[PDB]
Design a protein around this ligand. Sequence first.
Ligand SMILES: [Ca+2]
Ligand SMILES: [Ca+2]
Lengths: 331, 331
Amino acid sequence: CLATCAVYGDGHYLTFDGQSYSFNGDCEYTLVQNHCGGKDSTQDSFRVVTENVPCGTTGTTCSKAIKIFLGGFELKLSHGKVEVIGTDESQEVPYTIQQMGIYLVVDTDIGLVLLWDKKTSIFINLSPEFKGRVCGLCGNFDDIAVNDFATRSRSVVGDVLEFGNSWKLSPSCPDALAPKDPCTANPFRKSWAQKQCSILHGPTFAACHAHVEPARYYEACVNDACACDSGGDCECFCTAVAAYAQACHEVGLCVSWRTPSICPLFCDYYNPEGQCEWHYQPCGVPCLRTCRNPRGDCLRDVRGLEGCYPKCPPEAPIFDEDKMQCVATCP
Amino acid sequence: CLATCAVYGDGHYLTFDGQSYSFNGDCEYTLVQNHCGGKDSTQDSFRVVTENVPCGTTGTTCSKAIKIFLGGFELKLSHGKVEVIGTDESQEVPYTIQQMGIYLVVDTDIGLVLLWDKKTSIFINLSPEFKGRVCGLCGNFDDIAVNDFATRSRSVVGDVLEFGNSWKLSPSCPDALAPKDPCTANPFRKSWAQKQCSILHGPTFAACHAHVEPARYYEACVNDACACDSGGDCECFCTAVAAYAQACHEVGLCVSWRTPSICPLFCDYYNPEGQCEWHYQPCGVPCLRTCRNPRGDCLRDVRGLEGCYPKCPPEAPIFDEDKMQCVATCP
Ligand SMILES: [Ca+2]
Ligand SMILES: [Ca+2]
């Protein structure tokens, strides 16, 4: 299969091999890099970087915008939209923008796909052909967890703070420091945080409990809820729960955890007047007939997307994907 | 028409005549009382009381449960459910429980109807025949705003704190004090609070701006968002916005303010598998054919309810109102 590097919440990271760590810093860092040391192995260089800003009062940092550089093309992901800056007249545009469920998906011919929740999280999937050829925060794709702490010089350092700060992009940006305990800083929020995050240990995720241990995700939920004290704590809780749900869906199990009282969705909003063709799919539709993807072609490469999806009627089965309405014929 | 006494948020009150004031207290208080001084004017006594608990750290108090006493019948409204305690074998049950939209509606033959949002708010509508015969926090229904501060002894006192504390139900409960400024107490939340509550001054409520001045509601939204720092600030903001929306709907204007990113609803959750018969009605359906209310009878006495409503198909047009599904025939 394809390994996944996941970044979400307040500095929560998961390497391709499987190593997990927490690191926060008000700077710009590189997640995945190509051709480390300038070794152009007959492949175009691709680089993914992230920008972190201090959110909250404890000192935690959360991702704000993501910049993608590949083949001379620069893309900006901020405020829930895509902005193109670096344009190359020659060659051909290698990225395709597609909105599926609640995630923004970008596909590249080189084999790199990214999933964006448009608020804080980001998921990276890499083709197996790039094994042992990438460097960055996600670590080398050598399937070895212990040696994922290379500090930009092919040297493993046990200090997670030093490893994280070695990949900073701005030389003038300040060095990171050891974070404090958000729950200790804000004791009065601990009860509400525990009550909200107890759903992870509830019967809803009983099936996924055996496959994936939720202790780390539960701790992340508690810490984020404790720290998300600057407004919109519901967003922090929903992002943590959605990250755990996506992790569960990656294995293959499907869980329908969303309720009208817990992180609700408004699929009916997109429904046109007098018609109802939108529903919430927890597993997600495998393949949908669109103008860009006809009925014959499905392209079910990525699985694990959730959100509102249009259920076109037997008449006009193909979805426009541009006007947000079922169309009889795609031009 | 019928005057409305509205209680919502952190001690926000609106008298029947129109007087507005703010008062918070960790005690039990009587909203509307009947037969003041024991004057049984050939009418059964009805009494509505509320219980307030300290929510947050600033010191603000919000309603938790509501108890209704009338004709020897006692009802409890807590945890989003109705519990019956006082049961009278003789006579007949005078209250009917009906769930419409997002509000819980109780109807009485005497002419008293209450709307409950199940979280913090409560709306009281009184028949004009009870003019000048009721006492309590809502004040006498004499259509005079200046003399609404009777301190349980037919004496008007300019001290709002004294007027509020004169109606306490527990003699041993402590006296209330002057509240502080939540935004001053929590300065870092002011920017987010203002950004969220700025929707009131936006173009969405332009039509209602002329009829109703939103300055008081804007201040209430800002104060509640500043004080709602113990978790679930989104609930506080949504309750304030919904209170303003109900106030707008009382005049007659209809506003569709809910968006998937601002206080969303999950009407699709109640939809059975393979069927879609639920939609969000901002104005609210005037009358719906139910088992208790057939097609011939509409009973459009109360207007201004919003939430998810079932749109039954031409087949099985009457709604069950008990099994949450359209039924062909009501037994
Ligand atoms: Ca490694
Ligand atoms: Ca009066």
